Amino acid sequence: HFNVHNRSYLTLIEYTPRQIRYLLDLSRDLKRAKYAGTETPRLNGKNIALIFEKTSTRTRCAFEVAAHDQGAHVTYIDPHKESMKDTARVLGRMYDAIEYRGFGQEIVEELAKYAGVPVYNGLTDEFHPTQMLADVLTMHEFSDRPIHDIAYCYIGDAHNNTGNSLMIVGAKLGMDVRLCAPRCLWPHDELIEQCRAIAATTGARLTLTEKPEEAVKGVDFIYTDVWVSMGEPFEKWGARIEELLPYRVNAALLAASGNPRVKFMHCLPAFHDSNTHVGKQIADQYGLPNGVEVTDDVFESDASIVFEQAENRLHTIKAILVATLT
Amino acid sequence: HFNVHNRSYLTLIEYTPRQIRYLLDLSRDLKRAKYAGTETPRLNGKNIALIFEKTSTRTRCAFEVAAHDQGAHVTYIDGHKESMKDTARVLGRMYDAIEYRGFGQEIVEELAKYAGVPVYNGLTDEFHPTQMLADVLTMHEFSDRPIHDIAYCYIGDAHNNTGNSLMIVGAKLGMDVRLCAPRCLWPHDELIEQCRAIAATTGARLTLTEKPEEAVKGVDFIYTDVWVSMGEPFEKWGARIEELLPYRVNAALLAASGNPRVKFMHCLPAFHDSNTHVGKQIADQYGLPNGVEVTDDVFESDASIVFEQAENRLHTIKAILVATLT
Amino acid sequence: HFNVHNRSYLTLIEYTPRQIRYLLDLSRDLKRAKYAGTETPRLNGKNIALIFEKTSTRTRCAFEVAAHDQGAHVTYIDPGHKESMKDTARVLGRMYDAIEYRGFGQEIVEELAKYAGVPVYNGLTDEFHPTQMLADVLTMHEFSDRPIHDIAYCYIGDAHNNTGNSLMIVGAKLGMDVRLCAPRCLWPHDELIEQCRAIAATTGARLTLTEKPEEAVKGVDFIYTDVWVSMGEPFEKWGARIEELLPYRVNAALLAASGNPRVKFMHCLPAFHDSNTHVGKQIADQYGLPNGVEVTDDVFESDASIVFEQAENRLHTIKAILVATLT
Amino acid sequence: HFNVHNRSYLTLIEYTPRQIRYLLDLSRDLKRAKYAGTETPRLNGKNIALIFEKTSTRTRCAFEVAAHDQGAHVTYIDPHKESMKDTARVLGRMYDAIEYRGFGQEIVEELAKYAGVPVYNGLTDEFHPTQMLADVLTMHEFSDRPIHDIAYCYIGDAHNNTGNSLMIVGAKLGMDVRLCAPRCLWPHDELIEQCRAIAATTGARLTLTEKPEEAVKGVDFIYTDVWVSMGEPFEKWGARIEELLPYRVNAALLAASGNPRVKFMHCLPAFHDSNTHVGKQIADQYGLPNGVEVTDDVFESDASIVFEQAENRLHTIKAILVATLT
Amino acid sequence: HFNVHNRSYLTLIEYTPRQIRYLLDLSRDLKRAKYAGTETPRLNGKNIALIFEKTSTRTRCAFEVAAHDQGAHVTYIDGHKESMKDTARVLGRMYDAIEYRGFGQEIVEELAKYAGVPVYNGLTDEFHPTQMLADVLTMHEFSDRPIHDIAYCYIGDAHNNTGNSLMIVGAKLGMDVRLCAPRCLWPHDELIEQCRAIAATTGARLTLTEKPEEAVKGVDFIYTDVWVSMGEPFEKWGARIEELLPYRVNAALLAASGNPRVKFMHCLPAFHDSNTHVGKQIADQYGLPNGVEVTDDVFESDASIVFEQAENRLHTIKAILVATLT
Amino acid sequence: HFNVHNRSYLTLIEYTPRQIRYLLDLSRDLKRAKYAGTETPRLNGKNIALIFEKTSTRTRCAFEVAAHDQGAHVTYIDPGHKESMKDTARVLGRMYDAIEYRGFGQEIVEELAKYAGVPVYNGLTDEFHPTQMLADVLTMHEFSDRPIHDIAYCYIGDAHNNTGNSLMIVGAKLGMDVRLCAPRCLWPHDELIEQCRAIAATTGARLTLTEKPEEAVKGVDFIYTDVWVSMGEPFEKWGARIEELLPYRVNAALLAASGNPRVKFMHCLPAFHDSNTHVGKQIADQYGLPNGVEVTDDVFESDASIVFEQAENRLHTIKAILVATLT
Numbered sequence A, D: 001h002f003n004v005h006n007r008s009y010l011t012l013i014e015y016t017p018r019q020i021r022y023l024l025d026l027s028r029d030l031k032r033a034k035y036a037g038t039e040t041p042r043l044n045g046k047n048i049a050l051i052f053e054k055t056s057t058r059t060r061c062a063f064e065v066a067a068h069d070q071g072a073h074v075t076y077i078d079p080h081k082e083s084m085k086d087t088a089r090v091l092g093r094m095y096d097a098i099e100y101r102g103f104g105q106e107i108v109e110e111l112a113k114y115a116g117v118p119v120y121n122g123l124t125d126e127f128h129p130t131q132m133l134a135d136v137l138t139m140h141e142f143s144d145r146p147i148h149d150i151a152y153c154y155i156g157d158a159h160n161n162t163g164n165s166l167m168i169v170g171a172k173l174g175m176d177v178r179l180c181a182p183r184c185l186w187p188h189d190e191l192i193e194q195c196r197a198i199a200a201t202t203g204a205r206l207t208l209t210e211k212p213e214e215a216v217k218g219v220d221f222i223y224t225d226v227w228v229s230m231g232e233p234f235e236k237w238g239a240r241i242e243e244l245l246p247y248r249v250n251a252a253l254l255a256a257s258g259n260p261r262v263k264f265m266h267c268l269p270a271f272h273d274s275n276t277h278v279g280k281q282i283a284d285q286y287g288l289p290n291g292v293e294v295t296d297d298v299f300e301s302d303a304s305i306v307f308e309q310a311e312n313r314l315h316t317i318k319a320i321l322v323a324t325l326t
Numbered sequence B, E: 001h002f003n004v005h006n007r008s009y010l011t012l013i014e015y016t017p018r019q020i021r022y023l024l025d026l027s028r029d030l031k032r033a034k035y036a037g038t039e040t041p042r043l044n045g046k047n048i049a050l051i052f053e054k055t056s057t058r059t060r061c062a063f064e065v066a067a068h069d070q071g072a073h074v075t076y077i078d079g080h081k082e083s084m085k086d087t088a089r090v091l092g093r094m095y096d097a098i099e100y101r102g103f104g105q106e107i108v109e110e111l112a113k114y115a116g117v118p119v120y121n122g123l124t125d126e127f128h129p130t131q132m133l134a135d136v137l138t139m140h141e142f143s144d145r146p147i148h149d150i151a152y153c154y155i156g157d158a159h160n161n162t163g164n165s166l167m168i169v170g171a172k173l174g175m176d177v178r179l180c181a182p183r184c185l186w187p188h189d190e191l192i193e194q195c196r197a198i199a200a201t202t203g204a205r206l207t208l209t210e211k212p213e214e215a216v217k218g219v220d221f222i223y224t225d226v227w228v229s230m231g232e233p234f235e236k237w238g239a240r241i242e243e244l245l246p247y248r249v250n251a252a253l254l255a256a257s258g259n260p261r262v263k264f265m266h267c268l269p270a271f272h273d274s275n276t277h278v279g280k281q282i283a284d285q286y287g288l289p290n291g292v293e294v295t296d297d298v299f300e301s302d303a304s305i306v307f308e309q310a311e312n313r314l315h316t317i318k319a320i321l322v323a324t325l326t
Numbered sequence C, F: 001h002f003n004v005h006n007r008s009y010l011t012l013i014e015y016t017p018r019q020i021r022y023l024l025d026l027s028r029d030l031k032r033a034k035y036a037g038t039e040t041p042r043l044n045g046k047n048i049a050l051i052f053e054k055t056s057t058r059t060r061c062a063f064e065v066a067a068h069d070q071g072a073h074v075t076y077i078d079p080g081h082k083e084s085m086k087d088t089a090r091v092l093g094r095m096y097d098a099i100e101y102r103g104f105g106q107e108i109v110e111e112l113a114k115y116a117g118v119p120v121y122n123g124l125t126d127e128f129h130p131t132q133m134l135a136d137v138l139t140m141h142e143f144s145d146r147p148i149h150d151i152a153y154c155y156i157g158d159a160h161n162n163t164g165n166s167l168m169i170v171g172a173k174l175g176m177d178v179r180l181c182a183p184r185c186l187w188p189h190d191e192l193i194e195q196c197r198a199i200a201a202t203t204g205a206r207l208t209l210t211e212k213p214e215e216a217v218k219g220v221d222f223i224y225t226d227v228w229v230s231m232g233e234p235f236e237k238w239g240a241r242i243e244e245l246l247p248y249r250v251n252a253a254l255l256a257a258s259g260n261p262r263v264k265f266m267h268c269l270p271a272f273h274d275s276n277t278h279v280g281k282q283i284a285d286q287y288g289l290p291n292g293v294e295v296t297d298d299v300f301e302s303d304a305s306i307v308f309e310q311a312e313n314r315l316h317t318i319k320a321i322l323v324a325t326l327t
Ligand SMILES: [Cl-]
Pocket: A016, A017, A018, A019
């Protein structure tokens, strides 16, 4: 099944459609067991080491609950007196797996040669293949349609990791993907052509446009994300709000889909109000009190499934832990 | 039984006498099982998220052991970028409970409306209804008398949270409470009159006096706390010392009760010697080598039960976790 | 059997040979069970409080896995500002089954051990602790496959640090053939040498102290070294120590000088064997040591290196202490 | 809790009031489990060696049932070719505890230094702290009152081990103790003053009188024992009956208490009839057919609780075995 | 079923035929489980006190194995100082049953009124209803015929307890009983007439004769016992030998039955050779080298079932313990 | 494997080296399980009858704990007056799973073994039984930490009692270096010496018999002694035996004469090493031996004494026999 040697530190473009479907089915079964009270711990006695230099909460917390539900412990190693090559080989003889948050694909790949145990690259991080597994699992649950018939549109800053990953996964699974943003914020052309080649073999419909009205007509799901990602200078906001104001998700855009059942999605955190210190500061400076990338009315509406989407990250992380540690 | 909608974040004055007795009986049974080796984990598989802006050792440690004894796990989480209302709802779909240390009743009440799971306001914090449950359990164990016949005196700074809470619980349970302090350090009149109304329904005797010889006459327990509470300016020490020297707990005060079985209590930490660096600073400056609010002689005497009192906080936290998560 | 009252905070030189052998057998059995999948949790439901003033990774991680494998939980307490350590120990002793104190010193821990009411450890999670010596001896026994009192090893380098002192002590107690090789000014203190000579006379141990690497390693089964300077020792000390200890580097020629094709290399780690550390690169560039400082990268990565099996065995010896003292 | 190193061979005067209360609570919980059918064996696989030179039945049988109920085996070693120091060290490597019956406190204390396992001094013997735990447990059960409010009178030969032990335990626990006997048969004055010092700190009321009518007024329990203890010459009976006839327990004495609920107690065996070979011989010689230290009418009355008292020795012995072997 | 108040100390003649059949079926089932490895302990945790004035090996050993097989423990206890009525009531509150070996029916009946737990009269003793249950079970196993069609002859001293009991049980179960002995050694007339009345209700054939050739004609089993029973004066041997030589069991007597399948029985011990020091004394003095009451040739022959007969005493004791303690 | 029909009543000299090694491995594994808490009862539900004419404490207690640890029960039968032992054995063999005969002799037990129908032991609870030799060899292996056939030991004292005979036999069977040191009139019978020399030739054992203590102990790992007289031997024999055996006392000088700082002392117990026995005090006062008779109190209580570990191992070897013969 999911039998590749580098399966634990695979990047998203490397997943075959068969492997993705296998992990999605695994996530469905694990989620059913937890809801039904009949979960079977197959990681009893396992120990997982977690090494980081910068931290996360929403996705590091999903990881903890996934591990404990399956009977594993997590040990936190905090952030330079020993080479990472040496430390990985010491930890690989006491622990059953090592998670690296904040190091990048290249370092993790080298350490995988020497650890002797499965090594993950950011399983607890916001950018990881399991987030896309979680989003597609959410889309299948709410649409009740075959995955290759599902249509969705990502709108906003489409060249960040959320835009690139949504384009990739939709192409891999033969879905109807639309990315809507200013041309200067589209994914890199090299990546676009890579996903066009993928789409030809899977039947995927891939559209990139600057027109929100065209991008959302017929979609089951509308997906957005903060216009400035964590780390970029604040000074970038003023420019980005100028580019991306026409690309806000508001009630009118959902109606432009023509679909009464359309749902809204967001990988979170989201500036949908001024109850955040950063969000309020933007609300005062640029006159956006009702939300930046999505209005509070849409965020709190029954069309919003952001918190079901967040929950499904628990089950897909759990699926990776089961797939790679048993 | 404990079957109210707001049971997890109930404030002390909102508890009914029946609810308190139920949780005291629950704590006594759970303590019996732990001592006898027959404890049954009722919270296997549960995960509790712990969100905090401050930290403590004695009560955070009691919480951890209570959780593990019942089979639960604890995850520590450290607004800024995500609204607390957003964070609560994300955690509410992965975790079975959320503990908020150091946020205040109003915030926690609002977050309880949205989390979808039990929410506690400082269950791991020094100031919480479980501390009064532990103190009353300690009093009942050592006196061996019906709770409403027990007499005790709190002496010192009586308008801090220890003094307010001891007055409230004693009135709730029909006990004989004496608060002894200078008038300027008495509880607020609104709270006293609230407790007088409670005392009329329950038969409690509530006394507020400035004369220590009068306050301890006939008590089974004498209870004190640090004169300047953590958080208040250091400079309060100079004035409050002058006020509170006549209210020090020493051997003479215990004898003034006339009860050979009188016991001393203290919620801790206590400046009873110079082996704490704040306490030695107070000892050098104000000439208090024997201790500040209680003498080392009393603190170490066989009449001192401060450490049985500390232990019982574990069992009362456990009772709340069991009562609210099963 | 390990049934003394101060067994949890016992010092290395206070251990008897019978107690050391008992804990080594316990470590072997626990390691066998973990490998075979038949480990039996004897500490289910236990809670261990860990109070620390400094932190580590290799040994704190060994401790966590040891405790979890046996079913116990660990709670961390971090900075004695407002509560005296005596008060805190007595609060914790009524909720927890053991308290581990890292970074406080033997005398403080002994006094707290009186009042806590539960087993108390002095640096069970610290690099300097008797279980490190138990781990090293266990590693030597596994690889040499000969009785412990016939095993020969040489520690070479800064022989008056904790590694050198403890290796001389443990070798004398177990009747082994110990050599310490270092400049005369870096030998263990003369009173400790005389103590270990007295121990060696009763056990049959052969104890040698020499300034000559070629003689120190002749016939040894193991060559053992450590970093020449502690991060805790002042940074000035790094310059003079390196000048003294350059002739005591471990390299392929020193292993050849043993005359033993089966000789193994040991190091309690971390090791400055390349420039993938910021400090290791700075030592290498300033003092012209690109191939490694106290051991060459060639020896450290060779098949004769057993440093990572040596590191693993600390997990099993810590686990032995937890079982011996909490059951 | 019960954490002293010499806890297994402690003599009665060494017990702290906290330790006594802990063992009484342990006895209550163990007795409840046995009655309820929910007893948990925590001594499974333990082996206990029993070394004696003179034997007992009522208390050696309580010991056997206590050990088997908790999963332990008992091996009998019978009564000089090996030094007791050598034998103790051989047995301490095969067995988990050693019980010594008939050797005395001094020998047992020395052997405890070398056995390497808990050593008991007469846990199966009539004179042992657990008999006093059993008697106080009986008193609390039938009175349904706090132990320090309980009143009882021992009458008869008050300088034997029963009189000395009842005086000690009552002083330790703050009870109302009366000993009634001829002055020449009072406890040794040195012991009386020791228990007067104890009573001052615990609130105990300690009375020694020659007047039965004064000693029993207001008592919940009346306690007596055979006038001549096992071993003393028969010739001593003739003198003792002369001294102690006014101190017999008969129906009139129970009425002199003024308490309709008063109960009668006796550590047994008792000469309450002539169905014993020794008892009949006294009945013929000294004209006491209806009982010697207590009338048969009182012994068989509903006021008698001698057999509940005997049963409780099982549970207190069980409490010591649990407290010292786990 | 076995549901009478006096079931534990019932005498043989007090058993009803239904009760006997129930205990025989219980013994057959328990024996089947022990042989098949499927025995279920029904007496886990039970404690049986054993009070005795005499001792035996064969039947005390059968009792011990029956008790352990079912999970029970046995404690041996060795008046003088305590009345038996007092001792019984003390033991009745710690033990689940009491066995009295060697005291007589009347004493045990009185003690049953007070012990509060089942009391047996010599369940571990050679003379007990379970011995007849074992003998009848042996007869049924080997004959493979309905019990009331079985024929057997007891020969020898027929007014000892073996002869009395075989006459009683055979009448109770409708069997064909022949007692063969000199008239002066016949059972008492009162007992014979008691058994004749029983035989009329059950269809039993009861014969009493002096001619061995007549007594064994057509029997399936020939049964004998020692001519002088343990306890009787040695001097009875001289007279009783003279009386009982014509009644020796030898090969000729077995052939006189005319049944090739005839089996020999003996409750044991038996003087069948000179390897018992009493038996050799009788052999030397009276010229009986071949054996006394049975020849060594018959005892060791394949027609001898004395050892299957001995084993079945284990299973019948077990049936009584199960029937009376569950 | 221990699969002979007379395995339960096998005599020491009838054991093969393979069977001895098998039972020693079984003893090691059972001891490891008991220490680690992972002992598996293989004799649950068994009943063992114990018929005895004499009684003991050390070995009867080892037997009870061995049987209980494995789940079996023991029933005691005490005085062949009215029932022949053949009859009794056949009654018991149909209710019990094994019968242990103490104090009856090999020939009687062998004949009863034919008829009982269950395993029968000859003195499994007795001081003289092969499991005592298994226990002693196990003790020597644990403390020397070297292969059994390289182990050297000297038995010194009355070498023609059961201890001396059995130690010579077991050493020859296992290829060890045995020395017996005693007066010539107290050596084992010459026919047994020749038997053990024949055994020693096939196994490589080194067997020495000498009257010189200083030569007997040179190079030994263990010095082993026993009481000079049996309580069963007539009391007259005590006077002459002491005169003969005074030069063969074990004291600190004899251990020094071995030249081995690691030498250990062994004694099957009880030992007259002080006057805390009535008989030991009487020997000491009459013959002027206040410091001990066959061993000084100084040696008996020293760290070189292993008599109490030696005593414990009898529990594990008896347990090995019960498992090997009843499963
Ligand atoms: Cl594919």
